[PDB]
Design a protein around this motif. Structure first.
Motif, short mmCIF file in Angstrom:
data_model
loop_
_atom_site.label_atom_id
_atom_site.label_comp_id
_atom_site.label_asym_id
_atom_site.label_seq_id
_atom_site.Cartn_x
_atom_site.Cartn_y
_atom_site.Cartn_z
N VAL A 28 19.74 8.68 66.07
CA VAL A 28 19.00 10.03 65.83
C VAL A 28 19.14 10.94 67.02
O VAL A 28 19.00 10.42 68.08
CB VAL A 28 17.67 9.54 65.46
CG1 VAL A 28 17.41 8.63 64.25
CG2 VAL A 28 16.93 8.88 66.69
N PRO A 29 19.18 12.13 66.92
CA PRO A 29 18.87 13.15 67.92
C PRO A 29 17.69 13.16 68.46
O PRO A 29 17.55 13.75 69.62
CB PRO A 29 19.51 14.43 67.29
CG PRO A 29 19.00 14.25 65.65
CD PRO A 29 19.08 12.99 65.54
N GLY A 30 16.50 12.85 67.73
CA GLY A 30 15.28 13.01 68.12
C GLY A 30 14.43 12.25 67.22
O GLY A 30 14.65 12.19 66.02
N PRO A 46 15.45 17.76 65.93
CA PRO A 46 16.53 17.83 66.55
C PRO A 46 16.62 17.35 68.08
O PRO A 46 17.86 17.05 68.56
CB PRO A 46 16.54 19.56 66.60
CG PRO A 46 15.66 19.99 65.49
CD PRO A 46 14.52 18.83 65.64
N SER A 47 15.52 17.12 68.89
CA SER A 47 15.84 16.69 70.27
C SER A 47 14.24 16.33 70.52
O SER A 47 13.18 16.59 69.97
CB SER A 47 16.30 17.97 71.14
OG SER A 47 15.15 18.66 71.63
N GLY A 48 14.47 15.29 71.63
CA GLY A 48 13.37 14.77 72.40
C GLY A 48 12.64 13.67 71.61
O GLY A 48 12.83 13.31 70.34
N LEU A 49 11.97 12.89 72.32
CA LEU A 49 10.86 11.79 71.59
C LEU A 49 9.45 12.54 71.72
O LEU A 49 9.07 12.49 72.69
CB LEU A 49 10.95 10.53 72.29
CG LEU A 49 10.19 9.46 71.95
CD1 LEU A 49 10.33 8.81 70.65
CD2 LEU A 49 9.98 8.16 73.02
N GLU A 50 8.76 12.56 70.73
CA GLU A 50 7.62 12.88 70.66
C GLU A 50 6.48 11.67 70.06
O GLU A 50 6.88 11.14 68.81
CB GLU A 50 7.19 14.15 69.82
CG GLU A 50 8.06 15.38 70.39
CD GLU A 50 8.19 16.48 69.52
OE1 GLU A 50 7.36 16.48 68.42
OE2 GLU A 50 8.70 17.58 69.77
N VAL A 51 5.74 11.23 70.48
CA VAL A 51 4.88 10.11 70.26
C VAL A 51 3.37 10.51 70.39
O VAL A 51 2.86 11.15 71.35
CB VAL A 51 4.91 8.78 70.88
CG1 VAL A 51 4.13 7.51 70.40
CG2 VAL A 51 6.61 8.58 70.97
N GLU A 52 2.76 10.23 69.02
CA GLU A 52 1.22 10.66 69.08
C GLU A 52 0.51 9.35 68.64
O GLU A 52 0.83 8.79 67.72
CB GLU A 52 0.93 11.54 68.25
CG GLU A 52 1.35 13.18 68.82
CD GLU A 52 0.90 14.35 67.82
OE1 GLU A 52 -0.05 13.92 66.80
OE2 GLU A 52 1.16 15.26 68.31
#
Ligand SMILES: [Mg+2]
Lengths: 310, 306
Positions: A82-84, A44-50
């Motif tokens: 995309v929202p996230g 739903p929100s944010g950018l998360e990268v691993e």
């Protein structure tokens, strides 16, 4: 732009690649069975990268930013948004070793974005978008198409105009295999093209034209000709100056009849064959601190859709 | 390189900033009371970066790579090394709107790195490191030092290597506030309009006005209006940024020191009393998000876990 739904998720498996293959400077590429795996999920929100893949204790890998930029570019070309995003990478392709790590990351991101958008883009478009980033076009094409590829650029002169990047797949005989000898040093630096001359003899240009043609037939039907087809006069003799050790491994192998060449700009030496390289040769490399990868020619980038459709 | 301990965590709070302030192109900068929060924790393995802060339904924010780049460069300079990083950002500074989001992210990363490595870096080194990513020390130095700053991007040492970036604090009057008018534009390559040359007379003008501006900031806010006049970038950016340029002009035509914040599209007004609602709401109609800010202090680093 169409908004993609939360929960959509794909898993991309992209192979590394080796460029030039001897005389095919900036044109030939070969996909290799070592892989980066990129999972991309709409959140739903944010950018998360691993990013994972480094040995224990070692510093984190590169390319996370490159995969993200590639996903953004792919989404744009797909006219989607995309929202996230959550992006999880398991990278096994050795970086800065001439095995196509950056190109593969760009391909993974474009291909992921395409899969998320339910695949509106063509293979040709994926090759265009991924090639435009950091990794070279012959590597990116190999990662997209699989097998061996011929790639080329049209520098559009009206006016800027981003270059066209194109590629086509070669047929590779089923019994050809690839063995990588990967030294430790993160060198070569970007002084391996500062060693490439501005002028070459017509005779040397001639030589490479005929040997790249031989290499192509060698790959498709005459693996006995791999040794002849991997001869080069346009880039390896100059880079040998910068990579004296890699050059000794290539020379030593070639003198014994192995089809060895400089993978990209190095420092990895690659050997193509139909039979495995003898244990004694490989263990000699390993004892010298050279990693040995006994690889297969890989197929195309693969995109698995994880999230069920209803 | 020394290996830092797993489990060490810092929390960095960085202010955004406004550059140029009229005539002080690529020199003057002011730290503002809108903030990014960056938490960094050393973990056993891999890199984990998260950036939050956009509205519901909006595309995710930028700068996660910049923060990581800055952390790496700060770790290098601190001669420190890590087995893995968890980086979490909550950003409130609006991006690509002349409020120094990018520079603040660079500052956050170097400062986080510094704090992780037990602060071996000088304030001057942190300015150098964080300004290198932007080439805009006016924003970077502001976010590091706080308040108003004078920075000189020059000393392009020397032909050819890494230019040195430096800055010094100005002391701003406490009753000076900033009101940002943010168009809720920003198409880049904005040095289209920046000419190769300019007339000695226009160059003359800016040199006197940036000087008036420093005095205006320190002791005489009645000169803010005079101090914020420009002939070196704002009339050229006015071409690409109308509506902005018209909000600037009609504010300057009244009692207000308005300038282009950074390269836009935000119009900023420095003043000592609040701007009247009877003009602010007129801006809010025309698509402008009005933001009332104070002058911010320096980047803050809390070591929440030793
Ligand atoms: Mg490229």
């Amino acid at each position: 732009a169409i908004e993609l739904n939360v929960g959509r998720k794909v898993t991309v498996t992209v192979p590394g690649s080796s460029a030039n293959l001897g005389p095919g400077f900036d044109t030939l590429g070969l996909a290799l069975s070592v892989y980066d795996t990129v999972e991309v999920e709409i959140i739903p929100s944010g950018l998360e990268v691993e990013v994972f893949g480094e040995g224990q204790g070692e510093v984190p890998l590169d390319g996370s930013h490159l995969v993200v930029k590639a996903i953004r570019a792919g989404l744009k070309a797909a006219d989607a948004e995309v929202p996230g995003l959550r992006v999880v990478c398991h990278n096994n392709i050795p970086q800065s070793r001439g095995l196509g790590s950056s190109a593969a990351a760009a391909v993974a991101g474009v291909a992921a974005a395409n899969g998320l958008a339910d695949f509106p883009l063509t293979q040709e478009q994926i090759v265009q978008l991924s090639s435009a980033f950091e990794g070279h076009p012959d590597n990116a094409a190999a990662s997209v198409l699989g097998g061996a590829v011929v790639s080329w650029t049209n520098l559009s002169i009206d006016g800027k105009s981003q270059p066209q990047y194109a590629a086509v797949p070669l047929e590779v005989q089923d019994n050809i295999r690839a063995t990588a000898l990967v030294p430790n040093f993160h060198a070569s630096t970007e002084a391996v093209r500062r060693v490439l001359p501005t002028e070459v003899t017509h005779i040397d240009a001639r030589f490479n034209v005929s040997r790249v043609a031989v290499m192509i037939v060698a790959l498709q039907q005459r693996p006995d000709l791999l040794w002849e087809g991997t001869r080069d006069r346009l880039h390896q003799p100059y880079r040998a100056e910068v990579l004296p050790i890699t050059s000794e491994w290539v020379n030593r192998l070639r003198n014994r009849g192995y089809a060895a060449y400089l993978s990209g700009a190095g420092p990895t030496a690659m050997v193509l064959s139909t039979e495995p390289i003898p244990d004694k040769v490989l263990e000699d490399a390993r004892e010298s601190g050279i990693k040995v990868l006994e690889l297969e020619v890989a197929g195309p980038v693969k995109v698995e859709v994880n999230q069920p459709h209803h």
